[PDB]
Amino acid sequence: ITPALISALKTSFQKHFQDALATAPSTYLQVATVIPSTTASNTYGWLGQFPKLREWIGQRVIKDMAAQGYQITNKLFESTVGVKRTDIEDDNLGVYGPLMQEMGRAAGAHPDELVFALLKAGNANLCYDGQNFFDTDHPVYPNVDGTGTATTVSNLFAPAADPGAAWYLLDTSRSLKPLIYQERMKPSFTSMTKEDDEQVFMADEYRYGVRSRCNVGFGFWQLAAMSTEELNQVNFEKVYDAMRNQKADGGRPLDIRPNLLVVPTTLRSKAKEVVGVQRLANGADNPNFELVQVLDTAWL
Amino acid sequence: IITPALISALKTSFQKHFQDALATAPSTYLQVATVIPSTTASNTYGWLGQFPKLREWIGQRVIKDMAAQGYQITNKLFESTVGVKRTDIEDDNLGVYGPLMQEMGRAAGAHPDELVFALLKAGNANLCYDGQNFFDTDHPVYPNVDGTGTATTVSNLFAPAADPGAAWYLLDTSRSLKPLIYQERMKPSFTSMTKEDDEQVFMADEYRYGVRSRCNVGFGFWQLAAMSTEELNQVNFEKVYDAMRNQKADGGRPLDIRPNLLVVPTTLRSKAKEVVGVQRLANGADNPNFELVQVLDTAWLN
């Protein structure tokens, strides 16, 4: 029991923690974006401005200019683990040490359930426009002049109160991912191991909790889609055609190719006849075994 | 970036703010309280009671000790605490937390007044060195100098026939000891608990900023102060004043009680001003009690 032993133990724990948190199978990175923040809240400007280029010259020819803002209000999360009542000074530390690398792996994927919490409750979150995220009055600009006129359509699909499960169609080719991920501080490791410490005289359960600050938000509304009707080949083709047909101001094509698909496990049967068979479904009949292969997450 | 220099700067700034706020805290208890310093856990006051005087010296010296029993104030302590949440410290939101320490210091400085007035408002159900509350109807007064023999009924509490109103007090401060004595074992102290590896960094991140004090207040002698829930009228004030003035100690010796100040709740300030503080009455006649007492408004008595 010497300070050198404490230093070596802290170094070993730091190495073990740093080994994890890096190779975790992150899925939020596909739909989220890493942004370095510095304050407790970040405001937004434009919300539906597709960045594109025009023939005319100068570097000042056309642009949308920003609108009212949208804040993130970064939140906070934490984990904690430790049992060292008998591990220390007993040669039993060989265990309780490699098992927490899984804790690091799981904690590193937390943004996944955070983005899925936003995804599931997208209809109950206020949008900068004023109405629900999946409303039927999404503004569309006929011309670039102030606030000329905002026409709209029934953007998404929903039947007349027919039972079903909500499956979402997402895209990730554009780095303007539909969701946002703002982080103030990266996860940190704290060691309270202090010989004969006032509050750690209690056996030797040396607390090794961590601290982190981050949150997620909404980006583009058009990049994401939803469908609660019965999952069918005709309905799938309808959804794909509706999403691909989307056009921005001026009627200029977008080339938006959907890449990600999210389906609940209950609909997994249909999500498997749609993907994985080249004989009768997504095959002989309306072959569609190319894009938006189902990922079948379960954090919802 | 967080360094020990910033923590030291925060500590010194907080100390400066706390001391500045505490130094300029209004003092009100000093008017109707006596400060007696102590260096022990408790003190005994058995000298309350019979009023020392001069005698004819018929051939002996009359000395008095005090009963083996004591008042036994049994001083206690008080505290307060405030947090910072440790979340805006990194954001550099130093504009806030400046006047918070000022408010904390003002509250600490003003606490003794609240304690004194809370004790005073409990004078109906809190005993004095005698076996009767500070305001009662059957105070015992002896007919002998030594303090023995059949006693008589004495009352310093006046109440109406029905529908009693707010309570007001008439006290005296001319004498050496005021009716209430407020002890001070240790001056209010502050402790800046700002560390990166101390408790409440795990329970819930926030820095401990609290103060500790050891003080208590107790009654003096009931011969001066009095209470009356009746309406503050000219007749009521006159009767209370004349009853207080016409007081006789054990052995039938006058005390020469000269009431000094009148304490009323904030809701009776208008009545107190009408009774005392106006040269002419409502009808237009000179007051017979103008400038007789010094009205002292207070909010601690509701």
| Nearest-angstrom CA–CA distance, A27 and A262 | 11
Cα–Cα distance list, A281 to A178, A276, B175 (Å): 30, 9, 105
Sign of torsion over alpha carbons A121, A122, A128, A129:
negative
H helix intervals, chain B? 4-23, 29-32, 98-121, 234-245, 269-275
Amino acid at position A291, single letter: L
Angle between helices A100-108 and A3-19 (to 10 degrees): 50
Separation of alpha carbons B28 and B26, rounded Å: 7
| Spatial CA neighbour of A64 closest among A46, A77, A83, A78 | A46
**Total beta-carbon pairs less than 8 A apart between chain A and chain B:** 12
Chain A residues in contact with B197 by the CB 8 A cut-off are 192, 194
Residues 29-58 of A with CB under 8 A from B: 39-40
CB-based burial label for B134 (10 Å; 0-12, 13-18, 19+): buried
Sign of the torsion angle spanned by Cα atoms B97, B98, B99, B105: positive
Q: How many CB atoms lie within 10 A of CB A231?
A: 20
Residues 6+ apart with CB under 8 A from A155: A134, A135, A136, A138, A221, A222
Residues 188-207 of B with CB under 8 A from A: 197, 199, 202, 205
Residue of B nearest to A193 (CA): B197
Method of structure determination: cryo-EM
CB-CB contact of A249 with A144 (8 Å): yes
Both tokens assigned to A263:
């389906």
Q: Do A194 and B197 touch (CB under 8 A)?
A: yes
Contact assignment for B199 to A199 by CB distance below 8 Å: yes
Q: Report the chain A residue with the minimal C-alpha distance to residue B88.
A: A40
**In the Cβ-directed half-sphere of A26, how many Cα atoms lie within 13 Å?**
19
Alpha helices in B89-232 (DSSP H): 98-121
Reading the block at residue A47, the tokens are 């919300």
Task: Name the burial class of residue A44, with classes exposed (0-12), middle (13-18) and buried (19+) by CB atoms within 10 angstroms of its CB.
Answer: middle
This structure's resolution (Å) is 4.0
Q: Which one of A192, A194, A207 makes the best mutation probe of the B interface by having the most chain B beta carbons within 10 Å?
A: A192
Find, in chain B, the residue whose alpha carbon is nearest to that of A39. B91
Residue B289 token pair: 């009690």
Per the DSSP assignment, residues forming a β-bridge with B286 are B280
Instruction: Give the phi and the psi of residue A30 in degrees, each rounded to 5.
Output: -65, -40
Contacts with A263 (C-beta within 8 Å, 6 or more apart), sequence order: A165, A167, A231, A271, A294, A295, A296, A297
A119 near A168, Cβ under 8 Å? yes
- Which SS3 state, helix, strand or coil, does residue A13 take? helix
Rounded Cα gap, residues A277 and A265, in angstroms: 18
Beta bridge partners of B214: B77, B186
B87 Cβ under 8 Å from any chain A Cβ? yes
Of B91, B202, B205, the CB nearest to A39: B91
In this structure, what are the phi and psi dihedrals at residue B14, rounded to the nearest 5 degrees? -65, -40
Helices within B122-268 (DSSP H only): 234-245
Rounded CA separation A137/A148 (Å): 15
